[PDB]
Structure formats: structure tokens, C-alpha cells
Amino acid sequence: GKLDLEYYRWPVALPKLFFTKKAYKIYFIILVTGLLLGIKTFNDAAQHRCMALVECVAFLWASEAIPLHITAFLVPLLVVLFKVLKTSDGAIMSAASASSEILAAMWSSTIMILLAGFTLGEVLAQYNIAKVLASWLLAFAGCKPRNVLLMAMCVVFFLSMWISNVAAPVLTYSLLSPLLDAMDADSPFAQALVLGVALAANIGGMSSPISSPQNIISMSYLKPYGIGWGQFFAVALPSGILAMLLVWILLFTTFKMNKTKLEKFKPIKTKFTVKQYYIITVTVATILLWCVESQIEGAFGSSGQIAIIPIVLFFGTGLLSTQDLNAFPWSIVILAMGGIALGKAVSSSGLLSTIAKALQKKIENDGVFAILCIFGILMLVVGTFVSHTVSAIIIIPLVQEVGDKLGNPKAAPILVFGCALLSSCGMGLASSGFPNVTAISKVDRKGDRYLSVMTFLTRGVPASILAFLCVITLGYGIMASVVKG
Amino acid sequence: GKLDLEYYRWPVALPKLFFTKKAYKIYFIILVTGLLLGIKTFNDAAQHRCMALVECVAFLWASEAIPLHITAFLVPLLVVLFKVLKTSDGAIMSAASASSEILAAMWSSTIMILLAGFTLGEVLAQYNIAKVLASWLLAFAGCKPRNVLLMAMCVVFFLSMWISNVAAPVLTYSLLSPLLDAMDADSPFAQALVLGVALAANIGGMSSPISSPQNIISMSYLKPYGIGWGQFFAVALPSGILAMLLVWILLFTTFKMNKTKLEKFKPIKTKFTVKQYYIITVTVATILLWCVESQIEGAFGSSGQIAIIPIVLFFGTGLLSTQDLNAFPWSIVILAMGGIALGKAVSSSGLLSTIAKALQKKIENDGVFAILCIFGILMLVVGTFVSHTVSAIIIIPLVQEVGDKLGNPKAAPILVFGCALLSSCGMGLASSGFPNVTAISKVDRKGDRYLSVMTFLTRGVPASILAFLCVITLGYGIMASVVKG
Ligand SMILES: CCCCCCCCCCCCCCCCCC(=O)OC[C@H](COP(=O)(O)O)OC(=O)CCCCCCCCCCCCCCCCC
Ligand SMILES: CCCCCCCCCCCCCCCCCC(=O)OC[C@H](COP(=O)(O)O)OC(=O)CCCCCCCCCCCCCCCCC
Ligand SMILES: CCCCCCCCCCCCCCCCCC(=O)OC[C@H](COP(=O)(O)O)OC(=O)CCCCCCCCCCCCCCCCC
Ligand SMILES: CCCCCCCCCCCCCCCCCC(=O)OC[C@H](COP(=O)(O)O)OC(=O)CCCCCCCCCCCCCCCCC
Ligand SMILES: CCCCCCCCCCCCCCCCCC(=O)OC[C@H](COP(=O)(O)O)OC(=O)CCCCCCCCCCCCCCCCC
Ligand SMILES: CCCCCCCCCCCCCCCCCC(=O)OC[C@H](COP(=O)(O)O)OC(=O)CCCCCCCCCCCCCCCCC
Ligand SMILES: CCCCCCCCCCCCCCCCCC(=O)OC[C@H](COP(=O)(O)O)OC(=O)CCCCCCCCCCCCCCCCC
Ligand SMILES: CCCCCCCCCCCCCCCCCC(=O)OC[C@H](COP(=O)(O)O)OC(=O)CCCCCCCCCCCCCCCCC
Ligand code: NA
Ligand code: NA
Ligand code: NA
Ligand code: NA
DSSP: OOOOOOBOOOOOOOBGGGSSHHHHHHHHHHHHHHHHHHSOOOSSHHHHHHHHHHHHHHHHHHHTSSOHHHHHHHHHHHHHHTTOOBOTTSOBOOHHHHHHHHHHHHSOHHHHHHHHHHHHHHHHHHTTHHHHHHHHHHHHHOSOHHHHHHHHHHHHHHHHHHHOTTTHHHHHHHHTHHHHTTOOTTOHHHHHHHHHHHHHHHHHTTTSTTSSHHHHHHHHHHGGGTOOHHHHHHHHHHHHHHHHHHHHHHHHHHSTTSSOOOOOOOOOOOOOOHHHHHHHHHHHHHHHHHHTGGGSHHHHOSHHHHTHHHHHHHHTTTSSOHHHHHTSOHHHHHHHHHHHHHHHHHHHHTHHHHHHHHHHHHHTTSOHHHHHHHHHHHHHHHHTTSOHHHHHHHHHHHHHHHHHTSSOTTHHHHHHHHHHHHTTOOOOOTTSSHHHHHHHTOBOTTSOBSOOHHHHHHHHTHHHHHHHHHIIIIIHHHHHHHOOO | OOOOOOBOOOOOOOBGGGSSHHHHHHHHHHHHHHHHHHSOOOSSHHHHHHHHHHHHHHHHHHHTSSOHHHHHHHHHHHHHHTTOOBOTTSOBOOHHHHHHHHHHTTSOHHHHHHHHHHHHHHHHHHTTHHHHHHHHHHHHHOSOHHHHHHHHHHHHHHHHHHHOTTTHHHHHHHHTHHHHTTOOTTOHHHHHHHHHHHHHHHHHTTTSTTSSHHHHHHHHHHGGGTOOHHHHHHHHHHHHHHHHHHHHHHHHHHSSOSSOOOOOOOOOOOOOOHHHHHHHHHHHHHHHHHHTGGGSHHHHOSHHHHTHHHHHHHHTTTSSOHHHHHTSOHHHHHHHHHHHHHHHHHHHHTHHHHHHHHHHHHHTTSOHHHHHHHHHHHHHHHHTTSOHHHHHHHHHHHHHHHHHTSSOTTHHHHHHHHHHHHTTOOOOOTTSSHHHHHHHTOBOTTSOBSOOHHHHHHHHTHHHHHHHHHIIIIIHHHHHHHOOO
16 A cells, blocks of 8 residues: 655666566567567468467466466457467467457356355364374374375365365365464475375366366267276276375475474264255265266256255255355466467367377377377467366377377377376466466465465476376376277 | 355245345236247247246346346347347357357457556546546535536536546546545436436437437438438437437436535646656557547558457556456446347347337328327337447337328438437436446445435436437437428
8 A cells, every 4th residue: 555666766767566576577478479479480470370379378477477366367358368269160260269269268167166166165174074184184184294285186186086175275274274273384394295285186187087078078088998987997986096106206395394293183083063054964965976977967067057956955955155255366377268268269279189189290200109199298388377177178189190090900099098187287387277376376364375386386396207108107107008999 | 255145934934035125026027028939929939938038137237136247148138038139141040159159249349449548547546636627616606505416417528428438437537536425326417417428428428419429320320311410410319409408407306405515616726747648648549549430440441449458558557456456347338248238139139120110100191290209108118228339229220210101301311310319318227228227336435325316216217208308309309400301
């Protein structure tokens, strides 16, 4: 509310907001975006402008020159200013059509799932269910910080296996509240816990055939090859478990959390009440409906429609108030919507399809292992900046054609399965993916964020190579026998 | 956070939440919805189910059995459960397609405009611009509460004339903060001010050719008849002014606001600073870009894209924090999204078109005045429950065909103009329309809402008849000469 500004005076009078590090970052970003737009890169004008748009948004997010959710607000404006969206015929949309098309894509089923996760976390924490459940988990984990970390990653991984990683990190953070609440933002162990839940949700989003949209989509292509739930699990669960264990070792090695004193946790043995039993029943029913979504999709259509049921049943019954809904992390929602809009712009432009078909023209005729590693590297570099769902939708159909032409009869299922698993390894950027967006916005009791974008870059990029070597070594070894062709 | 419930005991043990008035309202609503679904009403099954859906949502909103923003969350779920959405060929959408199509309609351009209005109000109130401007307006208004009311309605009406009533009520409430802040929720004058700003924004949404989407759409049809900006103003501005004056008389007559003591307001004559000048410049530029949106639509596409500019320029420069964005009235946003979803369901099912074509087959061959009054009554009963934009989009094309077949050569322009003006008169329900949704959510310093849905029904329904008699008497009299044919 201060109405005063600082000036550099005669050195005739320019304010000091034009000479800060944020101003320098913005100058550099504008410079690079203008250079990309001016210099001819892609033959297609929409793809040429979408390359500049992707670079601009990615640099703005990585440098964090402005708040991450504000770049998310800025994405739709640039999608209309940079005429990147195209119609089905392939012509550039008019600005009005592009605006209506880009504002529609932000609100989606996963926004509903995230809001339901917020509702469930608040209702479990407010009525002492999460506190009771966190006394049995923390009793099993013990008094070693690395073991509590392992328990938290295992819990979020198992949750993401069945209900996906849109809402699993929120629920795990809600169960972690009895421990995270009394931890300052500069505590190494608290940072390790938040980052570990984020990374383990990212890894768990690739294990079960229903753990992510890119897994259901991949199974749609994989089914004709005879791959079922058991074959998918035998390959994707060991890979995810090994990747999660390696990331856990990285986390308790790179963080100075091992020398910490943890409160001894004796499990709470109180009896739940009728209100608490109602909350537990609604939570369990919502989780179960999220697990069997494909068998009730003819009525509900999506998990975002199922996500409404807890919201209505907890807010409509007075268990949660209007102030509780206004206290939701809406910056997380805005950041997620911005990520979705950027992915939709990339898909509509055709930018990623051209990159993927240019890669396809070179690495083809190569062996199945090499086409797997090169494409996995591609979706590891694209997936950390673009949504994994969009990247999988574009690439999984192409690797199928690449493998359908090879002499190996097991080549196509192996490539589709591998690219499905490797489509979730990009986790280095804190402003891409629901688990990452949730963890970057977590704040302590005083309001300071536990994690910066730099910590996410320094750990989640090594945690992306770790989750990528576990798929092309263990996962490929399991596919070599499991996949029959 | 209380884990205990009350029971009726042996009268063997049923809790007391099943015998409250809210439970009775819900029982009645389920009863009526099931009776509507069971009894055959409309030949089209989707329209027959949409009638029950509209009745259910309207009754839930009017009775306030559950919070209004929670019925807004419930609307998309019922749009999928009640299979009311249809494809372009007229076949019922699959639940997945219906879910993806109904969640895409919640986030729109007007949501962005409302968020920008929140941003502008917070940035003007936080940096003392609004308190400076409210010292010159309240000096002109004087020390009579009815005159302050007149000034507030005039300000919001003039704002809605140029930038529409999506953000004008928010800006007017921000300007009224120096007066509304120190007023408790049970004060008659505060309730009169909030309701008056709501009602005057509703009336102002019909005056200028760019005051509402149903005015731009109507001008699109009116242009071939020779009607221009001057002809539109000569008819719509006197009608709006008279309706606003009659509503102001209703407000200072039905509220015990006339016996009140108001603080003497001396104009604040301080000089703005560079930061305040930057805020003023950005606000004025955003308003001006909203006024000339049709001349810059080839670049921006919508006013919701223009609405992003203040958000980025105020949040990205640090003038507003993340906590300021989390303190936004998000229940208003959810309620608006629910209204939009209900309107889209009504449009897709074809329910409103069938009612409007059933009316058209009866009232046709009558005089131009009678077809005007009957259709205006229809859009006054539909517009208070369904969005005015959807109702206008459905009906304005039909009254054109009704008038194009009459013997009067001025019949079609008169009917299109009248139905454009009468499409904004429905203002009786507090959960329909941006000005109404904004006013029903306003809270005092202690958190108590100024207005209930009952107050909105008791004053805005007589304020809807008042705004409807002003169009068919003054407006029609002006059209009788202004319209040439
Ligand atoms: C309104 C005040 C600021 C509001 C908030 C600030 C951020 C949003 C507004 C500014 C964004 C850039 C608008 C101007 C360029 C749009 C692109 C365009 O016209 O089409 C491409 C443009 C024209 O394509 P057209 O759409 O076919 O006309 O490409 C070209 O062929 C010409 C490019 C020449 C170089 C122009 C210099 C632009 C530098 C990059 C600026 C990006 C900054 C993003 C924000 C970062 C900091 C926050
Ligand atoms: C002055 C510019 C340099 C400034 C320094 C920083 C700029 C950051 C670089 C970001 C990418 C922009 C440069 C790439 C342009 C290549 C276009 C080209 O040669 O096309 C010819 C060539 C022919 O045009 P066509 O007829 O459209 O096929 O295009 C291709 O076939 C594709 C070439 C490969 C393009 C790779 C682009 C990057 C992929 C990853 C995207 C997602 C990550 C975004 C963040 C980047 C950082 C990791
Ligand atoms: C206690 C906590 C709250 C949670 C409780 C919710 C439990 C109920 C949800 C599961 C029921 C769904 C079973 C039907 C799904 C299969 C559809 C199918 O096979 O499609 C064929 C069929 C058409 O064939 P298709 O086009 O090939 O799918 O699909 C339909 O037409 C869908 C049938 C609509 C059924 C209406 C009821 C939906 C569930 C009620 C909504 C929630 C209110 C619950 C109130 C209490 C009731 C217990
Ligand atoms: C076959 C005959 C069916 C009869 C009609 C259906 C009856 C069951 C559904 C409607 C229940 C309405 C009465 C209870 C809710 C009103 C009170 C309230 O919300 O506050 C409670 C109350 C606060 O209000 P207070 O006690 O009045 O202060 O909150 C609680 O104590 C916790 C809530 C406990 C359970 C309430 C909801 C139970 C129903 C959920 C099951 C599925 C509902 C499906 C709805 C559509 C059905 C087609
Ligand atoms: C899951 C637990 C509760 C969650 C939150 C509570 C509110 C949402 C869930 C309940 C909403 C109603 C679901 C069951 C009926 C759906 C309609 C349907 O199946 O299609 C029409 C249904 C079937 O059409 P179909 O879609 O072609 O199968 O219409 C008919 O022809 C049969 C109608 C017979 C009467 C059924 C009784 C329903 C009573 C109305 C309930 C509405 C209550 C709304 C909530 C108010 C309180 C909050
Ligand atoms: C047991 C039911 C009574 C329970 C008591 C409370 C019910 C509240 C009434 C809400 C409306 C539902 C009843 C109307 C059904 C008429 C259908 C009919 O006769 O069609 C035959 C008839 C022939 O079917 P067709 O082949 O589809 O044309 O339909 C028509 O031509 C249209 C008939 C006029 C329908 C008027 C419906 C109401 C218009 C306003 C909608 C927006 C406001 C929503 C809130 C209402 C309160 C103001
Ligand atoms: C200080 C507070 C901030 C506000 C300042 C913003 C002021 C600038 C906005 C107004 C400029 C728009 C003029 C062009 C609109 C007419 C388009 C037309 O005739 O369509 C034909 C033409 C195509 O014909 P059509 O398909 O029939 O429309 O439309 C276009 O291609 C659109 C041209 C794109 C121009 C790129 C620049 C857009 C404005 C820059 C975005 C904001 C960043 C400002 C940075 C500082 C620069 C001052
Ligand atoms: C032709 C050559 C063009 C050169 C490149 C364009 C330069 C102008 C646009 C970029 C300005 C970047 C430096 C200033 C902003 C960083 C500091 C900040 O946000 O905090 C300020 C500062 C807080 O940060 P602190 O002072 O560092 O603590 O807040 C203020 O004092 C109020 C903000 C005053 C005005 C700042 C924004 C002015 C630019 C708006 C005009 C349109 C922008 C269009 C962007 C895209 C262009 C293509
Ligand atoms: Na995956
Ligand atoms: Na990422
Ligand atoms: Na109107
Ligand atoms: Na209304």
C-alpha cells in the first residue's frame, strides 16, 4: 500500500525497478522471443510463432521473473496474440474464435479433481481424521527422517496408482499436516518431504493402467497386442518402485535432513463419531468411484463429475463453509489452467507433431532400443515443459507406426509401452504437472514457500534421468519377456 | 470442527438434521423433480429432462437450501446425469462428451472480465485512489442518503453503459468502500446501496449498443433496418434512465434508509504519486480498451483477453500479492460459472427454443404491441432464471421472423429492438446475472451478507416489472417515431 518509489536520480531521473534482476530477466526474455519471432525457424507460420510462445512461457516459468500463476494467466493472451491456434481444416483461427477456444480449454475434468482433492484434504484435516491416520503411519515409519520420507513417498505413490496424481499429492499433504505444520520453510526435512511427495506422485503417475490419462490412452493402443493389466503391471510397477527408491536415496542424500529429531508418534486409538464416519464414508466412496471410473463412465463421463460429489456433500451439508472454499489454493488452480492452455496451444498449432515427425524420419530403421531411448529423451525434454497428456497423444500414435514397420513383431507394443512409461519422466520444472504445481505453492505457517524453482531444477532433473534409466533398463528387460507380440 | 451431532432419541435414534427447514426444502425439491421427470411433459426426452433440471436448479437457488455457489457446482453434474446435451445432429451426447462440453463452458470471457474487475477494485482500494475518488462523488451527492443512493446507481449505470455490467458493479462497490466499509450488514441504507448498485447495473446493461452481449447481437440484426447508434440511444437511454429513477424511488421508499446520518465528505485534494499515476493509467487504458473492443477485436478477440492485461500488470509488478488473489471472491466466480453452465444446458437441449416457438404459433397474427408484451413477459420470466444472452440468442431471431411476416414494415425492427431491451429486465433472482451474483455475496466487516435472496425477490421482482413497463410505454413510444422501417 506504499505510494512511493525509489529513483536513481541523475545517474535525468529513472526509477530503480528498471535495473533489478527481475527487470533483466524480462529484458532477456523479450529479446529472445523477438529474436525467435524475427528469425525464420519453422516453415509453418503458426508453428514458428508457437515455438516463440513456448520459449517465452518456459523461460518466464523457469526464471520466475513474475509469479508462476501470472504467467499462467498470460498464456491465453499470448495464444491469441501469437496466432498459433488453427481450425480443423488447418487455417489460422480468427482472434475471437481463438479466444473462445483457448478460454474453454482451461476448465477441465482435472480442475474438478484438484478442487475435490482440496475439499477432501480440508475436511479430513479440520475434523481430526488426518491427524488420527498420521499417527498410525508415523508410528510405522519410526523416528528416522529418511523412513518418514520413504513412508510419505510410498503413500503418495500408492494413492497415485489408483486415483491418479491430480489429487493424490493434496491428500498426502493433508495426511502430512501433523508433521509439516510445525516445520519452518527453511527446514531441510520439510523441503525434502514436499519435494519427495511431488516426485513420488510424478513417478506413481506411470505405474497402473489407470494412473494417468496417458496410461489409459496407451492401453487403448496396447490392447490389440494382447497386453492386459497383469502384463502392464509386471513392467510398470517394478520400474516405478525402483525409480521411486532411487529418487528417495537422492532426496535423503542431497538434503541435510538425516540429523533431525522427530516427535515420537503413538497411534491415536480414539473412536470415530457419526460425523467422522460420514466424512470417512464419503471420502472412501469418492476414492472408490475414482478407481472404477471406466466402469461408471457411461453415467458420469469423467472423474471430474465424480469430483463434484464430495464438494456438494461437504459444502452443502455445512461441514465446510464459504470461507473454507475461499481459502483454497486458487493460485494452484490458475497455474494448472495455464499449463493446460499451453498444452492445447502446442497441440492445435501442430508444433510438437512436426518435431516428432522430424525425429521419426531420422531414428527410424534403427533398433528398437535406440528408437526407444531417443523418443524417451524427446518426451523427457518436452514433458517437462508441455503437459504429458498432450505429448503422449501426439507421440504414442507415431511410435506405433515406427514400430509397425520394423521387422520385429514385438517392436510396436514395446515402443508404445515404453513411450507410455517415459511420457511421465519429465518432472524437472515446478510449473508443469499437478504434483509439481501443488508442491511449489506449499507454504509454511508463516507463509514462506518450502520449495523454489531452483530446488526443483536441481533435484527433479536428476530425478528425471533416474526415472528414465529405470524404464529403459529394468522396464525394457521386463518387456523383453513379458511382451509376446 | 465439532465432531458431535444432535439426536431426537426415541421419538429408535434419528438425528435432528433430517427435520430442519433445509431438509424439508430438499425433500420438496426432490419430490418436485421426480414428479417432473416421471410425468410426461415434453415430446423430446432431452427437453423433458431439461425442464426438470431447470426447475431443480431454480428451486434450489430460490429457496437457498444449500449455498448458491454449491448449486452452481452441482449444475454440471446434473447436466451429465440428466442427459440433456445434444450434438449438432440432434442426438444425445455420451456422458464423456457431455462432461467435456459442459466443463468447457464454465470458463469464459466474462469470467476473465470479472477477475479483472476484482483486480481493479482491489488495486484502487489498496492504494487510496478509490477513497480519493469517493470524496468528490460523495461531496456532490451531499448528506441525504437518497442522494447518495442516486449517485451510486448513476455511477454504476454509466459504467455499465460502456464496459458492461460484468465488472461495473465491482468497480462501483470499490468506489463505495469508504462508505460501505463502516456500515453493518443490518443497516437499511447499506442494503439499499448494495441492492441499488445491483439493480442499476441490471438496468444499465440495456442502454448502449455495447452494454451487453444481447445488445451487440441485437445490433447485428438491427443494422440492415437502418438503426444506428443514435437511434439505439434515443430509445434505450430514456427507457433505462426512467427505469433506474423508478427503481431508485422504490429503493428509498421500501427501505428505512431516509432517517440516517452520513459523514460530511470533503473532497481529498492530495496529489497522486508515480505509482498511483501508473495504476490510474492502467485502469483508464483497460476501461478504454473495453469501450473500443469491437475495433480491436481482430487482435484481442474478446474483452476477456483485454481483462488479462490489468491482471498481469498489477500482479506481475508486485502491486498485488498472491494473498490478494487468494482473497478474491471465488464463490462469485463459481456462481457465475454455474449460471453459464445452466444456460448452455438450456441452449443445447433445445428447451427454450421449443417454448419460444410454441409461443410464436399463438401470439402471431396479433398486433405489434401485443407480440412485444407477450414476448417481453416471456423473456422476463426466462431471463430471471436463465442467462439473458442465451435467451436473446434464441428469441431475437424468432421475433424477427414473426415481424418479417407482418404487414407493418416497421414491425421487425420494433420487435427486435424491444426484445433486445426486454431481455435484460429479469433481475428478480439473486443467483442469475453478474450484478446480482456480485451483490448477493457482499459481506460486511464482520462477514455477514448485506442481502438475502428474499430481499432480492421482494425488491427486484417489482424492479423487473418497473423496467418492463418503461420499455413498452416510453421505449415503444420512442420507437414509433425513431424507427423508420
Ligand atoms: C498491454 C500492456 C502489457 C500487458 C501485459 C504484458 C504482456 C502481454 C502484452 C505483450 C505481449 C507481446 C505483444 C506483442 C507481440 C505479439 C505477437 C504478435 O504480434 O505476433 C507475432 C508477430 C506477428 O504475427 P501476426 O500475428 O501474423 O501479426 O510475428 C512477426 O512476424 C513479427 C515479430 C517481430 C518482433 C516483434 C517483437 C515482439 C517481442 C516479443 C514480446 C513477447 C513478450 C511477452 C511478455 C513477456 C514479459 C511479461
Ligand atoms: C536467437 C535465437 C537463440 C536464442 C537463445 C535461446 C533460445 C532458446 C531455444 C528454444 C528453442 C528455439 C530454437 C529452435 C528452433 C528450431 C527450428 C528449426 O530449426 O526448424 C527447422 C526444421 C524445418 O522446418 P519444418 O519445415 O517446419 O520441418 O524444423 C524441424 O524439422 C524441426 C527442428 C527441431 C526443432 C527443435 C525445437 C525444440 C524442441 C523442444 C521443444 C520444447 C522445449 C521448449 C524449451 C526449449 C529449451 C529446452
Ligand atoms: C455415499 C457417498 C456418495 C457416493 C455414492 C454414489 C454411488 C452410485 C454411483 C455408481 C452407480 C453407477 C452405475 C451405472 C454405471 C454404468 C452405466 C452403463 O453401463 O452405461 C450404460 C448406459 C448406456 O449405454 P452406453 O451409452 O454404451 O454407456 O448408460 C447410461 O445410460 C447411464 C445410466 C444412468 C444411471 C443413473 C444413475 C447414476 C448414478 C446416480 C448418481 C449419484 C446419486 C446417487 C444417489 C443414491 C443412489 C445409490
Ligand atoms: C426413497 C425415499 C428417498 C427420500 C428422499 C431422499 C433423502 C436422502 C437425500 C436427501 C437428504 C436431505 C436431508 C439431509 C440433508 C439436509 C441437512 C444438511 O445438509 O445439513 C446436515 C448437517 C448440518 O445441518 P444442521 O444439522 O441442520 O445444522 O450436517 C451434518 O450433520 C453432516 C451431514 C450428514 C449427512 C447429510 C447428508 C445425507 C445425504 C447424502 C446421501 C446422498 C444424497 C443424495 C441427494 C439426492 C437424492 C435423490
Ligand atoms: C452421490 C451422492 C450424492 C451426491 C450429491 C447429491 C446431488 C447429486 C446426486 C443426485 C442427483 C440425482 C441423481 C439421480 C437422478 C438423475 C437423473 C437421471 O438418472 O436421469 C433422469 C431419468 C432417466 O433418464 P436417462 O438419463 O435416460 O436414464 O429420468 C427418467 O426417465 C426416470 C425418472 C424417475 C424418477 C427418478 C427420481 C429422481 C428424483 C430427482 C433427483 C434430483 C435431485 C437433485 C439434487 C437436489 C438436492 C441436492
Ligand atoms: C407435479 C408437477 C407440478 C409440481 C409443482 C411445481 C412445479 C414447477 C413448475 C415448473 C415448470 C414445469 C411444468 C411445465 C411443464 C409444461 C410442459 C408442457 O405442457 O408441454 C406440452 C407441450 C407439447 O410438447 P412439445 O411437443 O415439446 O411442444 O409443450 C409446449 O409446447 C410448451 C408448453 C409450455 C411450457 C412452459 C414451461 C415453463 C416456461 C418457463 C421456463 C423457465 C422458468 C423455470 C422456472 C419455473 C417457475 C417460474
Ligand atoms: C498502458 C496500459 C496497457 C494498455 C496498452 C495497450 C494498447 C494497445 C492495444 C491496441 C492496439 C490494437 C490495434 C490493432 C487492432 C486492429 C486489428 C485489425 O484491424 O485487424 C486486422 C488484422 C487481420 O484482419 P481480420 O482477420 O479481418 O481482423 O488483424 C490482425 O492481424 C491483428 C493485428 C495484430 C497486432 C499485434 C499487436 C496487438 C497489440 C499489442 C498487444 C499488447 C501489448 C502492447 C505493448 C505496447 C505497444 C503499444
Ligand atoms: C524498444 C525497446 C523496448 C525495450 C523492452 C521493453 C521494456 C518495457 C517492458 C518491460 C519492462 C520490464 C522492466 C520493468 C518491470 C520489472 C519490474 C516489475 O515488474 O516490478 C516493478 C515494481 C516492483 O518491483 P521492484 O521495484 O523491483 O521491487 O513495481 C512498481 O514499482 C510498479 C510498476 C511500474 C511499472 C512496471 C511495468 C512497466 C511496463 C508496462 C508497459 C507494458 C509492458 C509490456 C511487456 C512486453 C513488451 C513487449
Ligand atoms: Na506414463
Ligand atoms: Na515438469
Ligand atoms: Na438488453
Ligand atoms: Na435474475
